Amino acid sequence: KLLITIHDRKEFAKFEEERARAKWDTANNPLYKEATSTFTNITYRGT
């Protein structure tokens, strides 16, 4: 009767979203620098 063990091993199949979802998704969109996607043309330099 594996139809249960094989049908139960699937429990982790979708749970794969729950984990990534967790509470605050372990990632409150930190961004850090996503807005200004223009990271300048490597022309940094400064004085």
Binding site: K1, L3, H7
Partner: peptide, 20 residues
């Protein structure tokens, strides 16, 4: 056939499957 009907139908309709 077993847990399938008794795993996703109970939280909604205690039906089997074909009848959803």
């Amino acid at each position: 056939k077993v847990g399938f009907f008794k795993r996703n139908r109970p939280p909604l309709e205690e039906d089997d499957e074909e009848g959803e």
